Amino acid sequence: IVTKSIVNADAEARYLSPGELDRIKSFVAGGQQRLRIAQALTDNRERLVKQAGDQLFQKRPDVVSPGGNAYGQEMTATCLRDLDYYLRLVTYGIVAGDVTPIEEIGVIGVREMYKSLGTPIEAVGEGVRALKNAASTLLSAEDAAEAGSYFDYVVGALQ
Amino acid sequence: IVTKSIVNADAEARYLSPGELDRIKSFVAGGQQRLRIAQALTDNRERLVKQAGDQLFQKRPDVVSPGGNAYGQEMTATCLRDLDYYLRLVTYGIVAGDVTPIEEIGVIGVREMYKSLGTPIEAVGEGVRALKNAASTLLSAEDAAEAGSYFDYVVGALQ
Amino acid sequence: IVTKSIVNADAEARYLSPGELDRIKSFVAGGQQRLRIAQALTDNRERLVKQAGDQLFQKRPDVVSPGGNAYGQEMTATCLRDLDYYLRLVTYGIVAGDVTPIEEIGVIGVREMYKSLGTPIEAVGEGVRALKNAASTLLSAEDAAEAGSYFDYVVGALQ
Amino acid sequence: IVTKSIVNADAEARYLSPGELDRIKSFVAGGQQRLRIAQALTDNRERLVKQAGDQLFQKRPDVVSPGGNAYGQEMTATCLRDLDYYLRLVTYGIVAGDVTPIEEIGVIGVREMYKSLGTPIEAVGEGVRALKNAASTLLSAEDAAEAGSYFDYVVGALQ
Amino acid sequence: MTLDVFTKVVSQADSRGEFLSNEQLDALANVVKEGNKRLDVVNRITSNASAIVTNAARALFEEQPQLIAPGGNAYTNRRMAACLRDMEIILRYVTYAILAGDASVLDDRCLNGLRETYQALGTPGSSVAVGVQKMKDAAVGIANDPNGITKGDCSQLISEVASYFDRAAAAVG
Amino acid sequence: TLDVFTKVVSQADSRGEFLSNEQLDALANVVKEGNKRLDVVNRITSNASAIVTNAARALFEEQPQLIAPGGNAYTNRRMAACLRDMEIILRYVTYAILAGDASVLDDRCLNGLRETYQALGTPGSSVAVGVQKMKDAAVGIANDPNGITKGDCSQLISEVASYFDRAAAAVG
Amino acid sequence: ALPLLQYKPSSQNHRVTSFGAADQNEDTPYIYRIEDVSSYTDIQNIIWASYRQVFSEHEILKFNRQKTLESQVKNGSISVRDFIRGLAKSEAFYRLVVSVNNNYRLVDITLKRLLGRSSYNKDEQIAWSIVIGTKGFSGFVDALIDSEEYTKNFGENIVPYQRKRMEGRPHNLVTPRYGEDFQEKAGTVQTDWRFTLDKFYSRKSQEKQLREGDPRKFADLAASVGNQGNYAQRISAFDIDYLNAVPNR
Amino acid sequence: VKTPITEAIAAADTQGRFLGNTELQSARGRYERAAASLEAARGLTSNAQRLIDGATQAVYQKFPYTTQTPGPQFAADSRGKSKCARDVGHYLRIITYSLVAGGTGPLDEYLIAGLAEINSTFDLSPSWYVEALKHIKANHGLSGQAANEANTYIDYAINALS
Amino acid sequence: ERDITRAYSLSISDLESKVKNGDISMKEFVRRLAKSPLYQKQFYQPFINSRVIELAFRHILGRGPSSREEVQKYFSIISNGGLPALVDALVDSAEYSD
C-alpha cells in the first residue's frame, strides 16, 4: 500500500500528501493483526484446500466428470495445487494490505490462461468462494471479514 | 463483405483497390449458392433445433438436471429459442458472406450476458456444434463445408 | 486427565467441578484425533528412531567418539533402544492427555540413573529434540504442535 | 568433438583440415553405437548407483563411520546423488564423444569444492571406479571398453 | 454374536450372578406389548424392501453423478449391480436389528469389517452414508403409516428404528 | 492380465471416449509387426531349457560359495529349487512378450518376490546377477538368424531386454 | 515335483477339538448336505450356499453361475466336492479372483473360501505359492481339495464353511477379492477424486513433488545400501610408541 | 479378461507348462482377423453420432408408450431422453471396444455382466435395447468381411439380453 | 504499442462507454488515457524521465524528438508538472491538432 501511495504521488510532481501519511501510519498500526491473520491462514493450508475441494466437487461435479478438465488423480492434484496457489496469493495480499502483489501474480492474465487450458473460470471462482467459506469458519469475526475482503477480490477477479 | 472492403479502403485515403473489386465480383458470383444454402437452412429450422437439443441434452445432462439453468419446460423452451436465434444468425452470416452481421448481433457481448444469466458458455458451444452436425447431415458436401464455416466461427466465438 | 482431575478434587473435600467436567468432555472429543496421532507414530517407529538418532550423532559426535558412552554396535543399539523407549512414552502421553505416564515411567528418577550410568543427560535431551523435529515433519501441522508439545515436556524434563 | 576441431582450426586462420573432416565423419558413423551405449547406461541408473554404493562402502567404511562426511541417511543420500550426477555426466561424455562437456560440469573445479565440503576426493574416485566396474558387468566387451574410457577419464580427473 | 432385548438383559445379569429383579421384569413386560406393534411395522419394511433400494438409487447416483459416469466406482454393470446387492444387505440386517430389538446383530455384519474393505477396494466409504441416510428418510416414512393399521403410539419404537440407520452410517463413514 | 490391445482399451474406457484413428493406426502397426513377434517367441521356448543351465554355469561359478557348504544353493533340493524357479522367470517373460505388455508379469512373477526373498534367507541380489545372464543369452538367440527370412526385429530386442530389466529390478 | 518345505503352523481356533454336537451355538453355519435332499428348497439352498462361499454372495449374479454344473448337482452325478472344483477351476472365477490377486494372496483367499480357514502365518502362504507356479492354479486347487484336512473335516458331500469362528469376523467380509496393493489396477481409485485428496498430503507425494536434486530423493536408496563403517580403534594413542614405530628401509 | 492372446496364456498357465505351438498357433489366427476387425472399428467410430440418434429415435417408433407414460424408468421426460443417448451410446462404445480386442471380453466385463440384475430392479425391459441394436446392425453401412465382424458382437449382445 | 485486451484482457471499461457515445472526442480520449493508472504502470514507472519523454512523443505525436530545444522544453514541463502536465502539453499542441 506504500507503493500505491508512492506511485500515486509520483505521477504528480507533489510530495506525499499527509493524508496518505496518515493511511500509511494506520496500516503500520494494523500490520500486527495482518501478520497474525496471515500466519493463521499459513499453518492451516492443508485443511483449507481439502474443504475447498470438498465444497467445489460437491457443487460442480463436471470437473469430476470425464468430459471436464480435472478428471483423474493427476488432474485433480493439479486442481488442488491451483487452489493452493490462490490461497498463497491471498496471504500475500493480506500482508501487503492492498491487492497489487496478488493481482500481479494471479489475476492480470488469468482469463486467457484458463481459456487456453480448457478449464472454466467459474469453477475456479467457486473454489475461491469455498476457500473463503472455510477460512471464515477458521477465523474469528473481525479476522474472517478482513480475509473475506481479499478472497472477495479474487472471486470478483476470476469472474 | 462489401462493407468490409469499403471501410477497409475508407480508413486509407485510397480508392477500392481492384483486387478488392475482384473479391466483390467473386462473391457476387457465389451469391446464388449462398442463397440456396440459406433457404435450405431456413425451411428446415425446427428439425435442426430438435436434433441440436437431442445431441446437447445427450451430451450435457446438467442443463436437464435441476441445478442447471435449463430445468423445466419454460427454461428448456428458452434454451431451444436461443439455439433458434443462433441458427438465424448463422443464416444471416451465410448470406452476408462475412461474419460481421452475425458477430454484431450474437458474439460481441455474449460472455458477460451468459455470465450474468448463470448459463455456461461451453454448453452453448456444444449446442452450436450439434447444429453444425445436423446441418452437415442435411446438406451436400460443398454446402456443409460452407455452412460449417460460419457454424465454426460461432463455436470458436462462444468459447 | 481423569486421574489428575480426580486426585485434584480428592485433595479438596468437594466433587468434580463443572470446569473440570468440561475439560473431560473436550478431552473425549479430541481423543479420536489423539488415537490417529498414536496410529501414525506407532507405524513410523523405525525410521523416526533412526533419523532422530542419526541427527543426534550429527549434532553430538562425543557419544560415538571412543571416549564416549555410545562407542560400539551394542552400545549404539542400546542408545537407539533408549530413544525407542522415550518415543513409546511420548505416544502414551499423547493418548492419555496427562504426563503422569511419561513421568512415572521415564522422568521421575532419570537424572540419578544417567549419572550412575556415565551417560550425559544433554545428549539424551538432544535426541528427544531430534525425535520432536522428525515427528513434527511427519504429522499434520497443528497435530504436530500437539505431538511436539508432549515431546517438549520430555525434553524440558530430562535436562 | 566438433567444437574441439572447430576451435582448433579457429585459433589458426586456416579452415578445417580434411583429416579433421575424416575424424568428424568417423564420429558421425560411430554415433549410433554411442547412442545405444548411452541409452543402456540411462535406463539402468539406479542399479549402477546401488552397486557403486555397495562397492564403495565395502571398500571405504569411513564415510559410513561418524567422523566421515557421509554419516546418516541424509548424507548418504547426498553421496549417492553425487554418484548419480557423475553417471549422468559420463553419459553426456559418451554421447559427445570427447570429454569437454563432462569436464566443464564435473571436473574443472571439483578439488576445491570437495575440499571446502570436507569430503575426500579419493573416495569419490573409488566410487566412479565402482560405477565403471558395474557398467563393465552391465555392458558387452566393446561397450564396456568405450564406457570405461570416459569412466577412466573421471577417475583420473578426481585424483 | 446374536443378542436380543430378552437375552442381553440375561447376559449382564449372568455376569453379576444375581436373580433377575422385579423392575427388570416390568421392563420386559413393557416389551411384550411393544412387540405386536413392531411386527406390524417391520412387515411394512420388508414388503417395501425392493421399492426402497432403487428409490435410494435414484438419489445416491443422481447426487454424486461421477460415480456412474466413466471413471467412478459404480460405472460398469457388475460394479453397478455390486452396489445394489450390498445396499439391500443394509436393509437385510437393519430389519434383523429391529426384529431382535438390539443392534448387536447389526454390528457383526455391516459394521465389523466394512470400513476395512471400503479402503481396500477403492470405493468411496463416505458416499455410502449419504444414501443410507436416504434410506432412513424413506424407511421411517413408510413405517410411520396411518393406513391399514389401528392407531397406536409407535413414536417410542420409531426412535429405535431411526438410530439403527445412524449406526449403519457411522461405521462406514 | 492385460495386453497391448486391451490396455489401449482400458485407459480409453476410463476417459470414456471412442477410440481415435491414430490409436487404430498404432494398433495397425502392432498387427503388422505381429508375425515378427511370434518368431521371436518360438525361438525362446524351443531353447528354454538350454538357457537355464547355461545361466546356471555362471550363476554358481561366479558366486561359488552358494553351492559350497553353507550357501543357500547347497543341498540338492535347494539346488533344484533355483532351477524350479529360474525357469519361471522365463515362463512369465515369454508370457510378457506374447502379450506385449509387462502387466501379466508384474501381477504374479514379481508382486511378492522381494518379500519371500528376505523371509527365506536367500540372497535377493544374487538372483539379478544371473537374470542378466539370461538376458545376454536370450537376445543372442532371438536375434541370430538361422533358417529364417531376413527381417528387422530390433525394436523387440530392446523391449525384450526391458522385460528382463524389470525382472531384475524388483528382485534386487 | 518337489515336496513341500516345512512351515510352522500358528495356533488358531480350528486346531482344537470343540467337543460335542448339542453344545455349539446357533451361529455355526448350516452344514448343508447333498445327502439330505427331501425337497427342492434344500436342493436350491445347497447350490446357492455353495455359490456363497466361492463368489462371496454379490457375484453369483446370473452370468457367473454355471448352469450345467448346477444342472448336474440335482441329478447327483457329481459330488459337492467335485462341484466346488467346477466352480473353483472356472474362468468365471479366474477373471474374478485369480488374475486379479497375487500368488501370495491367492493362497490366502482360496483357503478361506475352499477350506474355510485363514492361513496360519506368511510362511504357509509362501509354501503354497510355489505349488501355484509350477502346477498352475487348477493344479493347486486340485491339491487343496485332495488334501486330507479337507476330506477329514468336510468330507465328500458337505459344502465348506468357516470352522470355529467363535469370535472372528466372517471371511467373505474381512477379505475382499482384491487387496490394496492391486487396488489401482482393478479398482478406480485413480479416477475418483475422493482418494486423491488423501493422496495429496501423503508422504509419498512429497517425494514425488520435489525437484531434481535433493538427497531426500535418494533417501530410499540410502537405506538399501547398508555397509556401515567400523568404529575407532580401542587401543590408546599414547602407547603407540611413535619413536620406535617407524620401519627403516 | 477374455482375449485370444489372453486365452492362450490362461490355458498354458494353469497347466504350468510353456507356450506350445498350440497356444502360439491361436495367436497367429487372430492377426488375420484383426486386420479386418480394425476396419469395422473405424466404420462405427466415424458414423457414431448418426448411429446413436438413428437408434434412440428408432426405439421410440416401435415403443411409442415409452415417451408418454410418466415414470422414472420411462424416457418420456427430457431427463429420460438425456439418459437415452447415454445408454445406447454406451453400447456402441463397448461394441467398438470388443472389436479391437478381438474377443468378447470387454463386452463380457463391461456390459453384460449382471445385466439381468439391473434390468429387473429398474424395470428397464431388455426388449428396448435389442430393438436399438437391430437398427445398428442394419444401418452401419459396413460392407465385406468387416460387415460380418460387427455383426457377431451386436448379435452376441442380443443373445445375452434374451 | 501492443493491444492490452485480447493479449492480457485488462483495460478501462469506463472510458469506452463515453467514446462510443461521443461525450469526449479522440483528442480528449487520448489525453484521458495517457494520464491514467494503467499507462503509468507500463511506461512511466520503468523508464527514466528522459526516456519517458521520447516514448510519450511516440505514443501521442507519433514521432521522435526533432531537436535539442524540443527535449529541453518538454523536460522542463514534465519536471515542473509530472506526467499529466506532459500529457496536456503534448496533446494540446500545434503538431497534434494539425
Ligand SMILES: *[C@H](C)[C@H]1/C(=C/c2[nH]c(/C=C3N=C(/C=C4\NC(=O)C(CC)=C4C)C(C)=C\3CCC(=O)O)c(CCC(=O)O)c2C)NC(=O)[C@@H]1C
Ligand atoms: C454401494 C453403495 C457402493 C459399492 C458397493 C460395492 N461393493 C462391492 C464389493 C464388496 N462389497 C462387500 C460388502 C459386504 N460384505 C459383507 O459380508 C457384508 C455384510 C454382510 C457387506 C455389506 C464385499 C466383501 C465386497 C468384496 C467383493 C464381494 O462382492 O464379495 C462392489 C464390487 C466392487 C468390485 O468388484 O471391485 C460394489 C460395486 N461400491 C460402489 O461403487 C458404491 C459406492
Ligand SMILES: CCC1=C(C)/C(=C/C2=NC(=C\c3[nH]c(/C=C4\NC(=O)[C@H](C)[C@H]4CC)c(C)c3CCC(=O)O)/C(CCC(=O)O)=C2C)NC1=O
Ligand atoms: C500462482 C499463479 C498461477 C496460476 C493461476 C496457475 C494455473 C495453472 N493451472 C494449470 C492446470 C490446470 N488447472 C486446472 C484447474 C482447475 N480444476 C478445475 O476443474 C477448476 C476449473 C480449476 C481449479 C479448481 C486443471 C484441471 C489443470 C490441468 C489441465 C491440463 O492438464 O490441461 C497449469 C498448467 C500445469 C501446471 O504447470 O501447473 C497452470 C500453469 N499457475 C500459476 O502459477
Ligand SMILES: CCC1=C(C)/C(=C/C2=NC(=C\c3[nH]c(/C=C4\NC(=O)[C@H](C)[C@H]4CC)c(C)c3CCC(=O)O)/C(CCC(=O)O)=C2C)NC1=O
Ligand atoms: C440473438 C442474440 C440473442 C442471444 C444470444 C440471447 C440470449 C438470452 N438467453 C436468455 C435466457 C436463457 N438462455 C439459456 C441458455 C441455454 N440453455 C442451456 O443450458 C445452455 C447453456 C444454453 C442454450 C443451449 C437458458 C437456460 C435461459 C433461461 C435462464 C433464466 O431464465 O434465467 C435470455 C433472457 C430471456 C429472454 O429474454 O429470452 C436472453 C436475452 N438473446 C438474444 O436476443
Ligand SMILES: CCC1=C(C)/C(=C/C2=NC(=C\c3[nH]c(/C=C4\NC(=O)[C@H](C)[C@H]4CC)c(C)c3CCC(=O)O)/C(CCC(=O)O)=C2C)NC1=O
Ligand atoms: C522407559 C524408560 C527407560 C530408559 C530411558 C532406560 C535406559 C537404559 N539405558 C541403558 C544403557 C545405555 N544408555 C545409553 C544412552 C545414550 N547414549 C548417549 O550418549 C545418549 C545421551 C543416550 C541415548 C539417548 C548408552 C550408551 C547405554 C549403554 C551404557 C552401558 O552399557 O554401560 C540401560 C542399561 C542397559 C539396558 O537395560 O538397556 C537402561 C536400563 N531404561 C528404561 O526403562
Ligand SMILES: CCC1=C(C)/C(=C/C2=NC(=C\c3[nH]c(/C=C4\NC(=O)[C@H](C)[C@H]4CC)c(C)c3CCC(=O)O)/C(CCC(=O)O)=C2C)NC1=O
Ligand atoms: C554435477 C556436478 C556436481 C558435483 C560434483 C556436486 C557436488 C556436491 N556434493 C555436495 C555434498 C556432499 N557430497 C558428499 C560426497 C561423498 N560421499 C562421500 O563420502 C564421498 C567422499 C563422496 C561421494 C561418494 C557428501 C557426504 C556430501 C554432504 C556433505 C555435507 O552435507 O556437508 C554438495 C552440497 C549439497 C548439495 O547441494 O548437493 C554439492 C554441490 N554438485 C554438483 O552439481
Ligand SMILES: CCC1=C(C)/C(=C/C2=NC(=C\c3[nH]c(/C=C4\NC(=O)[C@H](C)[C@H]4CC)c(C)c3CCC(=O)O)/C(CCC(=O)O)=C2C)NC1=O
Ligand atoms: C408376525 C405377523 C404379525 C403381524 C404383522 C401382526 C401385527 C399386528 N399389529 C397389531 C396391532 C397394532 N399395530 C400397530 C402399529 C402401528 N400403528 C400406527 O399407527 C403406527 C404408525 C404403527 C407402529 C409404527 C398398532 C397401533 C396396533 C394396535 C393394536 C396393538 O396395540 O397391538 C396386531 C393386534 C392383533 C390384530 O391386529 O389382529 C397385530 C395382529 N401380528 C402378527 O401376528
Ligand SMILES: CCC1=C(C)/C(=C/C2=NC(=C\c3[nH]c(/C=C4\NC(=O)[C@H](C)[C@H]4CC)c(C)c3CCC(=O)O)/C(CCC(=O)O)=C2C)NC1=O
Ligand atoms: C511364480 C513366481 C514365484 C517365484 C519366483 C517363487 C520363489 C520361491 N522360492 C522359494 C525357495 C527357494 N528359492 C531358491 C532359489 C535360490 N536360492 C539360492 O540359493 C539361489 C541363489 C536362488 C536361485 C537363483 C532355493 C534354493 C529355494 C529353496 C530354499 C529353501 O527351501 O529354504 C520359495 C519358498 C519355498 C517354495 O515353495 O519352494 C518361494 C515362494 N515363488 C513364486 O510364487
Ligand SMILES: CCC1=C(C)/C(=C/C2=NC(=C\c3[nH]c(/C=C4\NC(=O)[C@H](C)[C@H]4CC)c(C)c3CCC(=O)O)/C(CCC(=O)O)=C2C)NC1=O
Ligand atoms: C505361431 C506360429 C508361427 C510362427 C512362428 C510364424 C512365424 C513367421 N515369421 C514370419 C516372418 C518373419 N519373421 C521375422 C523375424 C526375424 N528376422 C530377423 O532377422 C530377426 C532377428 C527376427 C526377429 C527378432 C522376419 C524378419 C520375417 C519376415 C517376414 C515378415 O515380416 O513377417 C512369417 C511370415 C510368413 C511365413 O514365413 O511363411 C512367419 C510364418 N508364423 C506362424 O504362424
Ligand SMILES: CCC1=C(C)/C(=C/C2=NC(=C\c3[nH]c(/C=C4\NC(=O)[C@H](C)[C@H]4CC)c(C)c3CCC(=O)O)/C(CCC(=O)O)=C2C)NC1=O
Ligand atoms: C495347540 C495350541 C493351541 C491353543 C493353546 C489353542 C487355544 C484356544 N483356546 C480357546 C478358548 C478358551 N481358552 C480358555 C482358557 C483359559 N481360561 C482360563 O481361565 C485359564 C487361565 C485358561 C486355560 C489355562 C477359555 C475360558 C476359552 C473360551 C473363551 C470364550 O469362549 O470366551 C480357543 C477358542 C475355542 C476353541 O477351543 O476352539 C482356542 C482356539 N488353540 C491351539 O491351537
Ligand SMILES: CCC1=C(C)/C(=C/C2=NC(=C\c3[nH]c(/C=C4\NC(=O)[C@H](C)[C@H]4CC)c(C)c3CCC(=O)O)/C(CCC(=O)O)=C2C)NC1=O
Ligand atoms: C456402460 C454400460 C452401461 C449402460 C448402457 C447402463 C445403463 C443403465 N441405465 C439405467 C437406467 C435408465 N435407463 C434409461 C434408458 C431408457 N429408458 C427409457 O425409457 C428408454 C426406452 C431407454 C433409453 C433409450 C432411463 C430413462 C433410466 C432411468 C430409469 C430410472 O431411473 O428408473 C441404469 C440403472 C440406474 C442408473 O445408474 O442410471 C443402468 C445401470 N449402465 C451401464 O453401466
Ligand SMILES: CCC1=C(C)/C(=C/C2=NC(=C\c3[nH]c(/C=C4\NC(=O)[C@H](C)[C@H]4CC)c(C)c3CCC(=O)O)/C(CCC(=O)O)=C2C)NC1=O
Ligand atoms: C455513469 C452514468 C452513465 C450511464 C447510465 C451511461 C449510459 C449509456 N448507455 C448507453 C447505451 C445503452 N443503454 C442501454 C440501457 C437500457 N436500455 C434499456 O432498455 C433499459 C431500460 C436500460 C438498462 C437498464 C442499452 C440497451 C444501450 C444500448 C444501445 C446501443 O448501444 O445500441 C450508451 C451508449 C454507448 C455505450 O454504452 O457504450 C451510454 C453512454 N453512460 C454513463 O456515463
